[PDB]
Design a protein around this ligand. Structure first.
Ligand SMILES: Nc1nc2c(ncn2[C@@H]2O[C@@H]3COP(=O)(O)O[C@H]4[C@@H](O)[C@H](n5cnc6c(=O)[nH]c(N)nc65)O[C@@H]4COP(=O)(O)O[C@H]3[C@H]2O)c(=O)[nH]1
Ligand SMILES: Nc1nc2c(ncn2[C@@H]2O[C@@H]3COP(=O)(O)O[C@H]4[C@@H](O)[C@H](n5cnc6c(=O)[nH]c(N)nc65)O[C@@H]4COP(=O)(O)O[C@H]3[C@H]2O)c(=O)[nH]1
Lengths: 164, 161
């Protein structure tokens, strides 16, 4: 099947599939009088995990992450993995306060429970940047603003959310 | 219209009027009609010890917390007394039970402000899914009965049936 729109490892959307889904969400969003929020998150200290315990361990962390995230969001919310240890969500909401709240939700639940990697339990946190797609703003533009907030989130110490 | 004057929530009439529409909706998205039936615990004690204005305020804050604790499409109603009925489309009763306990918890999490008087309140609920072609009223009764068991068991308690 023409399933090259998925991330093989986690079965989430990949960068390409994610970007194609934008337009239709723009439709839905204007439709239901909602806003389009992006949450861009990244697993903290991922190399440390990988280099220390091996690629399988890291792939395990990634799989557990994708799963927790998927489970913490409504069915219609887009969730993707572009590569590395980063998960990007797109949610239809009313205002940014709600987006931040969703972001810290994901963050806390990732922090709340360690992850089993071949009998070795590994504690992980996640950082996120999040923003609303501006009125008449293009998709990539908002994505980059969220990527940049994520950067600031890492710099500010990690395990935190930066709403912008 | 089809509203409870006091709280501007649906009344028994408004409830039954939407039901058939909720059936159609539930069928479309392969969901089940969930009913949560709840009653404020020890409500007369409040009315007596602080007055009908107070009792009426507690009722107003509940409608507001409940309503804020559900999604817009979830039906929230007050038939009368101090009881709030909710109708929510879901896929299995564990989900209905969680929703119920959530409402219960937030009701207990914060006293209710009665004009410079914060009063602790709790709520009890009984919940159930409607069977295929079941009369709303039958489902209503089953949840009302579980609500009763929840009261008899000690209140501040959910009974899923
Ligand atoms: N697309 C999307 N939107 C989200 C998500 N989480 C939150 N929101 C939005 O943010 C609003 C406020 O959410 P809230 O503070 O959690 O406050 C929530 C929450 O207390 C309650 N609640 C509603 N649905 C659920 C649920 O499926 N699980 C849990 N635990 N609580 C819920 O209802 C309140 C408001 O319901 P809403 O009117 O729907 O209002 C929501 C909703 O539009 C999400 O994962 N995806
Ligand atoms: N109509 C209706 N259905 C409800 C309500 N609450 C829960 N559900 C349903 O119950 C499922 C699981 O809820 P969950 O355990 O809280 O697990 C939730 C929860 O962690 C997260 N969550 C989703 N929306 C919200 C929200 O608005 N606020 C908060 N705090 N959490 C949410 O998404 C997870 C699953 O989302 P779902 O796929 O949508 O799946 C949901 C959803 O179908 C409600 O107030 N109204």
């Amino acid at each position: 099947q023409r399933k090259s729109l998925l991330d093989p490892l986690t079965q989430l959307w990949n960068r390409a599939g994610f970007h194609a889904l934008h337009q239709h969400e723009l439709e839905l969003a204007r439709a239901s009088d909602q806003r389009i929020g992006i949450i861009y998150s990244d697993i903290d200290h991922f190399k440390r995990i990988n280099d220390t315990l091996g690629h399988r361990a890291g792939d395990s962390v990634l799989r557990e992450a994708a799963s927790r995230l998927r489970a913490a969001l409504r069915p219609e919310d887009l969730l993707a993995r572009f590569g590395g240890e980063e998960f990007v969500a797109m949610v239809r909401v009313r205002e940014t306060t709600e987006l931040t709240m969703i972001a810290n939700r994901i963050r806390e639940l990732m922090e709340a429970t360690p992850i089993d990697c071949a009998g070795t339990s590994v504690p992980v946190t996640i950082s996120a940047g999040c923003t609303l797609a501006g009125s008449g703003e293009e998709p990539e533009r908002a994505l980059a603003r969220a990527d940049a907030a994520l950067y600031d989130a890492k710099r500010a110490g990690r395990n935190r959310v930066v709403s912008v």
